[PDB]
Design a protein around this ligand. Structure first.
Ligand code: OYF
Ligand code: OYF
Ligand code: CL
Lengths: 302, 306
């Protein structure tokens, strides 16, 4: 019993965190095999950040301009290349702690663990979701760039995010491990803003199924809804549209609890209309949207 | 910017998790130096749990009755003894991944990270607090016994909790690593219940300071209060009493934000008496009490653990 915002154990990723320094700038790098991945803005000074020409800034650097520190050991950079917004530094030592890993680009609504780091040293681990507006609501201070997001389903680390920047609203933007930004963001100091965010409907439904699995049914009602009528209502509360894919994905949770997906949608419609009336659901007075259907099944009893 | 429920990096503890099997029961053990610590109830059948005589149940076991698996390697148990509600299995190999560690008993209100494990394999990490009623609001399924709670202070892992049981309300009970239970609980299948809980006042104040640091100020007001008047309101709302020690501990956050501790107490008093009026604080509609003043300072300063 219980339901917590649970992160993956971070040890496999801690053994990959290194410090990358280029001139006066220091940030984090991810050391996998003989390559260290980090945000390409490590080659920029604060001045270069409005309209950096990364190809021009990079051509001026030699391997010895990159200082990579792994614990108390300096690694030797023997090559460098840029892939999109990530810089890849080839080093002369393969990381002996390299776990089984893959690079995966995720979709909005997907969750992942973030290992926040400073100076190549891990500070904390927390669970995040890629918001519908392609930002993440992280907890990052100056020096956290290059911290990564990941999942560890079945012993393989799937790296899905590398931290690059904080937007004016205090939310965060980054890339996948191939250096492609999530969303319409650029690694430039030019005026950029997070778009209007919405609630991840499929995740709220998954979390209502988690509440039913954990013994809470107060919010259920005798009604059902069509998928279209649900979407017309939910969008009035700034909820993402629920697709037939989301309905299919919720099938296993629907079968386990005996509550049809559109019946749970009717419950959600009623919660949006009524609020909680002084009650809580899984210790929350708000509808939680940072648990996916997969997270609920993984955490909850069967 | 941002403020998340953040756990310590778990790698140092992951390297200590092992699987302990005794007969039909499998649970988790903590392998530090040449000893594996686990709940003593690993030796009980379901019927033994009804009224166990642990000394008597243990005298019937030999070292070979305890199968300890560290990853894909079977460790050899060469001794066994009980300390309170923990069983200590001496093994023939010191854990090469043993971090610098201590065993510490925490007080209610203190937070810690839990590394939830099943079959000696870490599954997740989360943060929680020792409630004033000595339970933890954990997330644990069957097989999670022996999962541990810890803090990291500098390069030292302070182990403070070992999971033993789930109470009927779905909250959890366990011991320190010396096998002493937190709370008036016993390791027996008998009627037990979590007592009425209270809110950890000093932690709510710390989280209000975290909200101010992160740019949320709507709850601030021009008022102040005395510690006695604030404590009268705390008692009324099932909040733990705030001591002068708690005020002193909140001193740094008070100096940073410019909001005196008793000034923040008047904001909390108003929140208790009036509610949030449709507003949220750090994305929450409830007053959060599972961040200590130290957690707030640590998260807002970026302290690392290499
Ligand atoms: O966002 C950035 N720094 C940080 C990241 N995350 C959290 C933080 C918190 N507080 C200050 C700084 C932070 C850098 C510096 C600002 O301007 C830019 C512009 C583009 C890029 Cl790609 C990075 C940055
Ligand atoms: O609580 C216990 N098991 C678990 C712990 N945590 C979470 C769980 C979730 N779901 C089922 C079981 C769980 C065991 C089994 C029940 O009877 C007792 C009685 C005393 C003692 Cl010390 C332990 C136990
Ligand atoms: Cl995805």
């Amino acid at each position: 019993s219980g339901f917590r915002k649970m992160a993956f154990p971070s040890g496999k990723v801690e053994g990959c965190m290194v410090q990358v320094t280029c001139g006066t700038t220091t940030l984090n790098g991810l050391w996998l095999d003989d390559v260290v991945y980090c945000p390409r803005h490590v080659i920029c000074t604060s001045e270069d950040m409005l309209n950096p020409n990364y190809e021009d800034l990079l051509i001026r650097k030699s391997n010895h301009n990159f200082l990579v520190q792994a614990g108390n050991v300096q690694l030797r950079v023997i090559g460098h290349s840029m892939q999109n917004c990530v810089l890849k530094l080839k080093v002369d030592t393969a990381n002996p702690k390299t776990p089984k890993y893959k690079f995966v680009r995720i979709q909005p609504g997907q969750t992942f663990s973030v290992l926040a780091c400073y100076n190549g040293s891990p500070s904390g681990v927390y669970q995040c979701a890629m918001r519908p507006n392609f930002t993440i609501k992280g907890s990052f201070l100056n020096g956290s760039c290059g911290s990564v997001g990941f999942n560890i389903d079945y012993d393989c680390v799937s790296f899905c995010y590398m931290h690059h920047m904080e937007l004016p609203t205090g939310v965060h933007a980054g890339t996948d491990l191939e250096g492609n930004f999530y969303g319409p963001f650029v690694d430039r100091q030019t005026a950029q803003a997070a778009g209007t965010d919405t609630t991840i409907t499929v995740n709220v439904l998954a979390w209502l199924y988690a509440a039913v699995i954990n013994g809470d049914r107060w919010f259920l009602n005798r009604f059902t809804t069509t998928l279209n009528d649900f979407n017309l209502v939910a969008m009035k509360y700034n909820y993402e549209p629920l697709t037939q894919d989301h309905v299919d994905i919720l099938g296993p949770l629907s079968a386990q609890t005996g509550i049809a997906v559109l019946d749970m949608c009717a419950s959600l419609k009623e919660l949006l209309q009524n609020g909680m009336n002084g009650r809580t659901i899984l210790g929350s007075a708000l509808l939680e949207d940072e648990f996916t259907p997969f997270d609920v099944v993984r955490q909850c009893s069967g």
